[PDB]
PDB file of N, CA and C in Angstrom:
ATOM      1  N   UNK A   2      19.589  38.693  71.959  1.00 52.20           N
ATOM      2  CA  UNK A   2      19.569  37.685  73.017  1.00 52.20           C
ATOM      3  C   UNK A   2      18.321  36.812  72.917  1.00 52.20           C
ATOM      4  N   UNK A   3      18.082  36.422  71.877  1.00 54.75           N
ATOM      5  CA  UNK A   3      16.452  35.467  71.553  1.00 54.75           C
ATOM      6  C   UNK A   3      17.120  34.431  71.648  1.00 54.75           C
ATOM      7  N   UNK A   4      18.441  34.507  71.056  1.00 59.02           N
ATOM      8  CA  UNK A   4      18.744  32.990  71.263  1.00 59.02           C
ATOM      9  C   UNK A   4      18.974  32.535  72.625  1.00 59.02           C
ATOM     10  N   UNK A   5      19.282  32.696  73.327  1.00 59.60           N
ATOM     11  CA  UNK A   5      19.554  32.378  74.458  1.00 59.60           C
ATOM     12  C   UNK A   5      18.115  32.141  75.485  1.00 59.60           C
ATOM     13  N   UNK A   6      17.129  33.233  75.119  1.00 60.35           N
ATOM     14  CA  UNK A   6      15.987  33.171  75.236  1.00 60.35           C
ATOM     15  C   UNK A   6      15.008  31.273  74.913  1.00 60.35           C
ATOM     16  N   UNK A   7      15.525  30.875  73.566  1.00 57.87           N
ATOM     17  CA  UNK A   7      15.106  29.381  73.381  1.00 57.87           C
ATOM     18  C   UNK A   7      15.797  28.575  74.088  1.00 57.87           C
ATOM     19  N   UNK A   8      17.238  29.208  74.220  1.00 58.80           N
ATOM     20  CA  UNK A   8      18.234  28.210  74.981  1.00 58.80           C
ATOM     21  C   UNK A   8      17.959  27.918  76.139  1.00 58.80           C
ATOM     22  N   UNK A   9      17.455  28.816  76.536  1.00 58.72           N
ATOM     23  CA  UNK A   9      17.729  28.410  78.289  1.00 58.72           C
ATOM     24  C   UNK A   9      16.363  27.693  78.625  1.00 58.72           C
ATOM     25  N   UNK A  10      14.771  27.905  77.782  1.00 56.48           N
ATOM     26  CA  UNK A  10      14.012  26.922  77.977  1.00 56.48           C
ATOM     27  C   UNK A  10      14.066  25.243  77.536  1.00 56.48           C
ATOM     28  N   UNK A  11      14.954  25.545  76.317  1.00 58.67           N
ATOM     29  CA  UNK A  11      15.585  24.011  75.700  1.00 58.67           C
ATOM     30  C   UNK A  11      16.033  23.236  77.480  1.00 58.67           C
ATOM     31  N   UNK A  12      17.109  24.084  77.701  1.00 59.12           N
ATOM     32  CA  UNK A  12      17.714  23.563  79.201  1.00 59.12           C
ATOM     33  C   UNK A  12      16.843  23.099  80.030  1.00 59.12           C
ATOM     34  N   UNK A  13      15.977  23.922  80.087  1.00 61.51           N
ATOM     35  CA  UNK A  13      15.002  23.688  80.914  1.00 61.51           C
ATOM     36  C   UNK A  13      13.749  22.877  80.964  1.00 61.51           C
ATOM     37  N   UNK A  14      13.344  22.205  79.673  1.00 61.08           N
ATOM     38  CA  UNK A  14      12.847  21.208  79.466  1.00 61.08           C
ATOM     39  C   UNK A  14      13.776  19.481  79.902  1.00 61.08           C
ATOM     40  N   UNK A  15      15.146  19.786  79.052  1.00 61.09           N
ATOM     41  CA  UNK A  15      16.155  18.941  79.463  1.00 61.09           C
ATOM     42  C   UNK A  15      16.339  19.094  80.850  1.00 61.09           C
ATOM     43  N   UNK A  16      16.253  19.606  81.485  1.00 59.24           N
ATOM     44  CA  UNK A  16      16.355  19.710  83.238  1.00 59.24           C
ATOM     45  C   UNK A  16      14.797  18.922  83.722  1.00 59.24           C
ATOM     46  N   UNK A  17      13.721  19.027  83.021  1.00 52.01           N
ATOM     47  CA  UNK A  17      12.898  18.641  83.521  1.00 52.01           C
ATOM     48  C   UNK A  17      12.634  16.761  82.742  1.00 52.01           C
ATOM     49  N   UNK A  18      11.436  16.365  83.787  1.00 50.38           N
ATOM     50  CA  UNK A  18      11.280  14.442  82.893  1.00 50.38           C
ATOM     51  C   UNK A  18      10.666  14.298  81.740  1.00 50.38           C
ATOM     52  N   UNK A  19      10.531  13.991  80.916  1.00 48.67           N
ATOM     53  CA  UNK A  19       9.937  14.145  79.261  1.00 48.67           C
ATOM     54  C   UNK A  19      10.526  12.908  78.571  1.00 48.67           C
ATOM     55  N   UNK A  20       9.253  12.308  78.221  1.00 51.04           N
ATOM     56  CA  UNK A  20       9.070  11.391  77.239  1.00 51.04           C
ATOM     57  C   UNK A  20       9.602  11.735  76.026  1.00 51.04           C
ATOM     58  N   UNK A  21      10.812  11.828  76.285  1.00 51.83           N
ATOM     59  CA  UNK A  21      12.149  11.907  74.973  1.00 51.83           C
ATOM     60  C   UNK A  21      12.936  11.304  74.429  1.00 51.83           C
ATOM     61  N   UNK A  22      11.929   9.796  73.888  1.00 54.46           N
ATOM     62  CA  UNK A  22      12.885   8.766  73.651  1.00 54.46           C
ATOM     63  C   UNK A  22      13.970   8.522  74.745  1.00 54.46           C
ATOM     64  N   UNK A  23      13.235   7.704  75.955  1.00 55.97           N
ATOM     65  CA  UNK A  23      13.968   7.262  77.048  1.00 55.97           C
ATOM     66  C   UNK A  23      13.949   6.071  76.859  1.00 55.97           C
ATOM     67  N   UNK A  24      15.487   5.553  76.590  1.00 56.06           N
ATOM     68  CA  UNK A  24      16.003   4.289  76.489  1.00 56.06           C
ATOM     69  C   UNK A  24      16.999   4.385  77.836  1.00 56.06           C
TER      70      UNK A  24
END
């Protein structure tokens, strides 16, 4: 379950505002 472990902070960056190439 590690993966899910990166996954769910991935989400959770994407849930949060971040200068991620915002067009």
């Amino acid at each position: 379950s590690r993966q899910v472990e990166l996954e769910r902070e991935l989400a959770e960056l994407r849930a949060r505002p971040k200068p991620d190439e915002r067009a």
